[model samples]
Target: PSMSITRLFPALLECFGIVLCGYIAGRANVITSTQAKGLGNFVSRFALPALLFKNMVVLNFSNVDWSFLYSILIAKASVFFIVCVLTLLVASPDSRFSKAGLFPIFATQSNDFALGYPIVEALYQTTYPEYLQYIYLVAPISLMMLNPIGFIFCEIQKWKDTQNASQNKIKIVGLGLLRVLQNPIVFMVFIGIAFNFILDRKVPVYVENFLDGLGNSFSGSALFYLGLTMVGKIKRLKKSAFVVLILLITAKLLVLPLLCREMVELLDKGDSVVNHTSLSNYAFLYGVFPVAPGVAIFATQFNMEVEIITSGMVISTFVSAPIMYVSAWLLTFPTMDPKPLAYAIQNVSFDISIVSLISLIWSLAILLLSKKYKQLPHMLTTNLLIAQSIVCAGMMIWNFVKEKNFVGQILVFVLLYSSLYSTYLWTGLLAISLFLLKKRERVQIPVGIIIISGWGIPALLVGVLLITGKHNGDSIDSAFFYGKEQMITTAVTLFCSILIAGISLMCMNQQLTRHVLLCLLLIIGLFANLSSCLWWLFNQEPGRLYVELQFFCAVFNFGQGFISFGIFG
Candidate 1:
């Protein structure tokens, strides 16, 4: 049969699973601003790095067509340059719209990792198995070339507009490079490739399993975050922005693929590498897949107008996913033998139908719901946001625990505690102390003391554990232990040194400053938790244990740091 119910069932279910998740997020109010921000941090700093590491290490470089990689890079760069020229010609150099050029450029760049990879998996299983290596090759290449280059161009443009003639261009370039290097995405990709190529070592099983567990949480959580951010912001989409989006979408999904196909024909080298004509067709499909959700994230991070970028990324993804599936089918099926064609037809048909139905329903539901509810209560919204944050955290922790690394687990525990306690002590104590002092003649000194002590003690404990390596649990062998115990002990001493400082702040009634400190502490803790989660997810294998570990750690940290501390501090 050209299409079987067997294939249809799984595809339909998977598509609906994601869409239903989106709808639930909309209705349940679980997706909030804070959660959205946290999710953004999680994806960018942790989940993304893990994903890149896992994918990069596992990829069999032997079959990669260097020519295809180079060609795609050249094509993408050329397109980017052309877009820059067009933007310069069209938008006034001094105008704000000129700064908006990067938005469209990123929209066209496409997110091959998040969206395209799964589609490529589906397509290969169905029609073009021989060209799977090409997809793999393109995946890392897209990460390495597209993001760094695109970011460099955007930053340079921003700097040119912001800097005066008196400023040093050389210094600006150095700063830009540093900024790029500091980006978590760039750093992870670079490290991942280096680890794989130079060391010839795969990410350890524990880390790989951890990452695999959290990897499953990413797509749904990420999309929900996008939805929350987009909720009221949709009205901000202007006619000009819509036009730009449409043009960018057309360029990304239609024109780019057509151009790539032409390039492949001109170059005519895929066959020599892969022994198949399907490489060009696969590359074409790769070009058409949706813009990654990450683009909007990057835009928001750098203070670009997020509304346009968000709408462009979301709408383009919803549109391009199905289009790519259908177009890939038509292009690849015709060129294949009967068996492959049958396989392709069956798989692609089910994939397209399922994804299309789910996406349509989900989008309509969100649109309707947003129209109905103009405003929601801030606290209720906040709770839901916290819940989602916990969920993402939990997912990360679950992945970590499965690795069975006492050291990693201890790090995760400390990080979680730090996040929770810092957020709680600072936010809670400051808020309560200020309210009490302002309203009453006398402050409850004992209550304030108790709260500060609670947070301070935990902070001290975390530091101690880090310094002594005792925090990691006992070692199985002396050689394996290293100096972790001493490290934990040193950390404890450092915390002790800072303890008096925190007490001094409390004594001086620096309530607002305390709250600010709490916020900073929470931010740092969150960053640490996020980093640990990424390490766990990318380094560990895929399994239930990892999932559970990630989940527990996330909940523990959020509860202790944000929930308990925010209320108390």
Candidate 2:
């Protein structure tokens, strides 16, 4: 059964549209950046504390799994040390001002409340009516981990900033941690926890609403402030930061998640919650969430690494919706869930034809128009983008009218959107807008890089899926996860990606390899998604969610690839 567009649309709009609207409003001066800062302050100080408190107070912790909580400690700590050490020694050595002064904690922050809650509501609202799985991570647990660490970083950075700050390692670190305990968010977390356990998670309705009143605004206020602030920072995004930026993207989105799952696998001695893949996966899932929206507030408070902080937050938030979708899709289509691999095959196939075909036509059009200025419109390039989009729309519809499902069609839709809308249309709009702006203020974002990335990632995913559906038909039907056929799927995916990467990178010199690496990452992220879809599709009997789950994977990747081109371009 398909989810109602009405329900989905509201969530989509609430999550993404608020930021877009904020960006628009900020650009238009509906609110000043300073004003936005005030909003951020209000959110960080009052709203978050209230919300964090109320959230825990309502969560029943009588049967709370202590081992699972400890597991989060292990997983989160591993990523923390890895990231802090990198930022400490490499990115922000001297712990004082350096080029990459922003802490990696920004990337580590998860959308536990915003995106995570909505997903829990959508998937388990009716299906698994019994468990409160989300409770384990939210309330007392994540809040406990994030705030204390957040403050400790702030103090460390502050100490670094002091002209004659103490060099005593343990004393300095100990002093910082103790003072961080005094911070309000930390106090709130303790208060929340004590309430959850001692009082058994009860709070009066008025208190709860009061928390909601404060907490609810954090998302919109923080997001809008980012949009308001982001434009000013674009000029500051120098080539110098590119190296650091790539590391941030990797550790934040990819490595943190991997580290968490490994902890869950190795350290857990079979406690129910600790052993549960679903629970453990969220540990990984949070790691992959776009850098925290609230980091803008943190940056303003600290007055350090504003550009990296703002840019990373704005960039990550825009693209992460789809990535989050990919995470959700993984659980949704896991072995217990239906695979619907065959239909998924069609979706990817149909989408590939339209997107790939457009690239072919666009290539010819660009060369054809380059020769004659008069033949092109005054806004020929602008119109080129519009026209390109129109073609995608018509062709995407045409493909839909002509295609099949569950995994393939959804992926096809995702890739097409990533390529067309996220990559070409939105990116082109920005590039062209910058082109129209006043001198020095305008930043040149190459249309080609974005266009290439959009196409390449989907092409890779589509190729791998096509090969998977072809070579592993029987294995898919029998059992495929971590199996021989998957290994083959892995091999072919690698072969195809390397072939694509080889040709593309071969075309470029060593200096511009960042672009190649960006596309290469798309290689791995997109591969795991569809491969998981196929593996699951094969292992399970088709059920009600077969279509929805498959479609979900496709859409997430589609959005992920599409949204990402904005920053890269």
The Cα local distance difference test for each model comes to: 0.51, 0.50
lDDT of 2 by residue, 260-296 (tens): 6676666656756523665556556555656755555
True-structure lDDT of candidate 1: 0.51
Q: Total clashing residue pairs per candidate?
A: 49, 13
* Worst ten in a row by lDDT for model 2: 473-482
Report residue 507 deviation for candidate 2 (angstroms): 9.8
Per-residue error at 276 for model 1, in Å?
3.7
For model 2, what is the alpha-carbon lDDT of residue 230? 59
Error of 1 at 354 (Å): 6.3
State TM-scores per candidate: 0.54, 0.61
TM-score of 2: 0.61
